[PDB]
């Protein structure tokens, strides 16, 4: 029962950036803390152990330092291949335990979602079912709002979203939310919008159709 | 060079059993300790226990004491996880790394590729395709965006493409999200040119191996309804 906890969860940087993440421990663990880095879909690999020795292989821009409770890695100059999840874990028991992790994103400049609204397509409405589509596209930070109203109501519950990884040439995000009702909900109902709040916005921005003039 | 290598992805029902296998290459595998660590979806990495092949002593997590089995068979280098009732609960990737002392601590040095495990209620099922395209009169911008939302399928993953692998720029396709039903839904959108709208077709194809099935969607909005 020794828990680690990483701070913070998640970093923007630039290549070239010193990055500092630390790792705190709920008791002493000595020397014993070893850090590690994972890609999406692969394994982690091990980058430090002993709080400050270097794996073999592993480049010496990657250093680690603590000792006790508090510990911290340190990547200098920061490159491409270093957009990555971090991971502490300590071994000073045989019952190993986990950090929560630290993703470290690419930094960029504000960027403005362009938005965009789908309504539900007839052939899934013969079905029983109307999905309502909002989009954002190509935006940075990756914190956004997004609501959905039907005639003039937000709505709760009823909607899903998701987002794409940092895009390999802007790194932008993008987002999708989808809002769904039954057929004979939608048809009640006359006006539907998607309200967006970002930084890049100076007030939020709301798409919306009606039904019957779509 | 030290390699483990894990034992494929696995789809199961919940009270099914399950064994999987990390098979150990490249150095003599009853002179170290193998780790097992799960990875929940969207989550971090969690310590599960080890087993010592040389003695086959295992050692496990609080939290996964009782709750599954770590085994070994040395004479053919593999060690092995185990389930005798699955919950949906259990639906992670799962890791086995090679320990290695040094530093006068455990490390894991080298790591298996993972094994998914996905357990669900749901049954195989190909996805839906419906199109995302614009109302007649809202393109007003110089670039418009077009999709397909593909829903209802299970389990992952989809392939999409469009305009049969022609079209490649623009295109996000969205991490599918899992519905109340049990069944992924996700979208894949392209931004185009507004001018191309009358002018060029386009068209997303959806694979899904899992059924068997292929979906191809034109992207249109209808004059009428
Ligand atoms: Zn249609
Ligand atoms: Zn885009
Ligand atoms: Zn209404
Ligand atoms: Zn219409
Ligand atoms: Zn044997
Ligand atoms: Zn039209
Ligand atoms: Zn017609």
């Known amino acids: 029962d020794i828990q680690m906890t990483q701070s913070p969860s998640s970093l923007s940087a630039s290549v070239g950036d010193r990055v500092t993440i630390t790792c705190r421990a709920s008791?002493?663990?000595?020397?014993?803390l070893a850090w590690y880095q994972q890609k999406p879909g692969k394994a982690p690999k091990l980058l430090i152990y002993?709080?400050?020795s270097l794996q073999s292989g592993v480049p010496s821009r990657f250093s680690g330092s603590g000792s006790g409770t508090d510990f911290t890695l340190t990547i200098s100059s920061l490159q491409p291949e270093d957009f990555a999840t971090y991971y502490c874990?300590?071994?000073?028991?045989?019952?190993?335990?986990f950090g929560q992790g630290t993703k470290v994103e690419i930094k960029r400049t504000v960027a403005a979602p362009s938005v965009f609204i789908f309504p539900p397509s007839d052939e899934q409405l013969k079905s029983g079912t109307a999905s309502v589509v909002c989009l954002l596209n190509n935006f940075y930070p990756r914190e956004a709002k997004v609501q959905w109203k039907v005639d003039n109501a937000l709505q709760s519950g009823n909607s899903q979203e998701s987002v794409t990884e940092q895009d390999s040439k802007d790194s932008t995000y993008s987002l999708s939310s989808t809002l769904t009702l039954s057929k004979a909900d939608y048809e009640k109902h006359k006006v539907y919008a998607c309200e967006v709040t970002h930084q890049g916005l100076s007030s939020p921005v709301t798409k919306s159709f009606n039904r019957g003039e779509c | 060079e030290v390699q483990l290598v894990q034992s494929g992805a696995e789809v199961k029902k919940p009270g099914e059993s399950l064994k999987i296998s990390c098979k150990g290459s490249?150095?003599?595998?009853?002179?170290?300790?193998v780790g097992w660590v799960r990875q929940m979806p969207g989550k971090g990495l969690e310590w599960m226990g080890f087993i010592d092949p040389s003695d086959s002593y295992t050692n496990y997590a609080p939290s996964f004491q009782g709750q599954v089995t770590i085994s070994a068979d040395k004479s053919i280098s593999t060690a092995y996880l185990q389930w005798s009732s699955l919950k949906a609960s259990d639906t992670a990737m799962y890791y086995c790394?090679?320990?290695?002392?040094?530093?006068?601590?455990?490390?894991?040095?080298?790591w298996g590729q993972g094994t998914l495990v996905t357990v669900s209620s749901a049954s195989t099922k190909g996805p839906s395709v419906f199109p995302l395209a614009p109302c007649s009169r809202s393109t007003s911008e110089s670039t418009a965006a077009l999709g397909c939302l593909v829903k209802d399928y299970f389990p992952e993953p989809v392939t999409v493409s469009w305009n049969s692998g022609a079209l490649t720029s623009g295109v996000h396709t969205f991490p599918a999200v899992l519905q109340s039903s049990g069944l992924y839904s996700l979208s894949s959108v392209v931004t185009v040119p507004s001018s191309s709208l009358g002018t060029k077709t386009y068209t997303c194809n959806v694979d899904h191996k899992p059924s068997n099935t292929k979906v191809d969607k034109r992207v249109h909005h209808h004059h009428h309804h």
């Open positions: 002993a709080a400050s």
């Open positions: 874990q300590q071994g000073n028991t045989l019952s190993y335990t």
């Open positions: 008791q002493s663990i000595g020397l014993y």
């Open positions: 490249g150095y003599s595998f009853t002179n170290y300790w």
């Open positions: 790394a090679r320990e290695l002392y040094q530093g006068y601590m455990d490390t894991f040095d080298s």
